[PDB]
Amino acid sequence: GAMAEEQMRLPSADVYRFAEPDSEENIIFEEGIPIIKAGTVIKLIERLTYHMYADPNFVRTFLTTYRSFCKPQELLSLIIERFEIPEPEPTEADRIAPLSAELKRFRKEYIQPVQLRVLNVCRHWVEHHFYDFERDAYLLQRMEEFIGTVRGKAMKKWVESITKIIQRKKIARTFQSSPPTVEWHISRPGHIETFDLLTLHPIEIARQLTLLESDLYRAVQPSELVGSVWTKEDKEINSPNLLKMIRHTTNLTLWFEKCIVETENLEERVAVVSRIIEILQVFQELNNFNGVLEVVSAMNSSPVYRLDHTFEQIPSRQKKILEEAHELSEDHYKKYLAKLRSINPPCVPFFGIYLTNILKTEEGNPEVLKRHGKELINFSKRRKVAEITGEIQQYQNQPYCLRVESDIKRFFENLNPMGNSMEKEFTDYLFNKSLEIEPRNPKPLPRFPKKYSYPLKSPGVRPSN
């Protein structure tokens, strides 16, 4: 009948694997274009390059998330296999001569569509995920060999499009208004040896940290966050921008804490804490939420939070600024999310919430769905992770109208509060320091000598003008 003639126009299973019929043990749909919930890798590949229509949302999401279920080498082999569609046997009259009625139909309404879909996938792959090819030379060699063997009229427009992108990527390996004057306090321009928390201008500390954190945020690719690859063995290769962002947050947070608890003299320590709150204030003015929450993290850390004698001397206005910042996180980040959505560019989003929500998604949904004793890759799980990475991306084109100061930038890039200590070791030391500088009751509060020989008064956070 009509379904048999439809199916038998497609190639048989013993000569092509991507044309078995859809069923409940190779593909499930979640509910226009149908949105795939789960399927076998062969079925995903089929739909990724489906003949009947374009599916830009599925291509995008697949190429973002596929490494969580299929290696790049495997994916390339599977799309090349998908591309090499066999033609059916001829009829008796054609064999003798050729009319080729059904064969010419098959080329037009199946082979050519599917092949154009494969090239589209190849183009999206090299354009948006070239890193796969940077990390694997043989993969690139295979792609270029494949693309250079593609023949036909329709193809050359694609083959030239793809080849130009590849060459572009091999070769690939400002201010709209006046930025404000760079601010200085005690440390003079160029006197890098005296650069420190209290000697640089707090306005400029916040500005330069904001530029640095903006660039780090903007560099994170979505695939660095898929399948929790940043917590796995090849993290340094798969998640290098992500790791740089996380490492910066750790180092800055711990450096704030170190600055505080290593200032043993009470009065000086109050000046340190106060200065850090002023930096938070400028982060808030810049909508660098990432920076705001780094300060909140340090202030709420075990070593710092317990310093009641220090916080007692912090003016009420600064306590209130710090409290409002901590409030951002309360009730599953309700105030933070509302604020993030209400502002205009530029901003730096709080990065940690993405990591937290991605990990909850990874840990809370199964890798596969089981139907009829068969395992289907859970694609909705990948799509949810991709949607969270999509939120990240929507804030990645927001440059600040701030001038870089190269020496201050370098100072923050090179922070290493931990030295040669492991983190746990260092945070235990911070807490023991906290105990030394403000002992638990009923132990008396000792006095400690001053360590700073320059004035402690802040220049404030109002810029010159």
Curated annotation (Swiss-Prot):
Molecular functions (GO terms): epidermal growth factor receptor binding; GTPase activator activity; guanyl-nucleotide exchange factor activity; molecular condensate scaffold activity; protein heterodimerization activity; protein kinase binding; SH3 domain binding
All copies of domain Ras-GEF, residue ranges: 201-440
One Gene Ontology cellular component: plasma membrane
Source superkingdom: Eukaryota
Gene Ontology terms: biological process: axon guidance; B cell homeostasis; B cell receptor signaling pathway; blood vessel morphogenesis; cardiac atrium morphogenesis; cytokine-mediated signaling pathway; epidermal growth factor receptor signaling pathway; eyelid development in camera-type eye
Domain N-terminal Ras-GEF: start-end pairs: 32-170
Keywords carried by this UniProt record: Disease variant, Guanine-nucleotide releasing factor, Phosphoprotein
Organ and tissue specificity: Expressed in gingival tissues.
Illness the protein is tied to: Fibromatosis, gingival, 1: A form of hereditary gingival fibromatosis, a rare condition characterized by a slow, progressive overgrowth of the gingiva. The excess gingival tissue can cover part of or the entire crown, and can result in diastemas, teeth displacement, or retention of primary or impacted teeth. GINGF1 is usually transmitted as an autosomal dominant trait, although sporadic cases are common.
Assembly behavior: Interacts (via C-terminus) with GRB2 (via SH3 domain). Forms a complex with phosphorylated MUC1 and GRB2 (via its SH3 domains). Interacts with phosphorylated LAT2. Interacts with NCK1 and NCK2. Part of a complex consisting of ABI1, EPS8 and SOS1.
Role this protein plays: Promotes the exchange of Ras-bound GDP by GTP. Probably by promoting Ras activation, regulates phosphorylation of MAP kinase MAPK3/ERK1 in response to EGF. Catalytic component of a trimeric complex that participates in transduction of signals from Ras to Rac by promoting the Rac-specific guanine nucleotide exchange factor (GEF) activity.
Protein name, as recorded: Son of sevenless homolog 1
Organism name: Homo sapiens (Human)
Gene name for this UniProt entry: SOS1
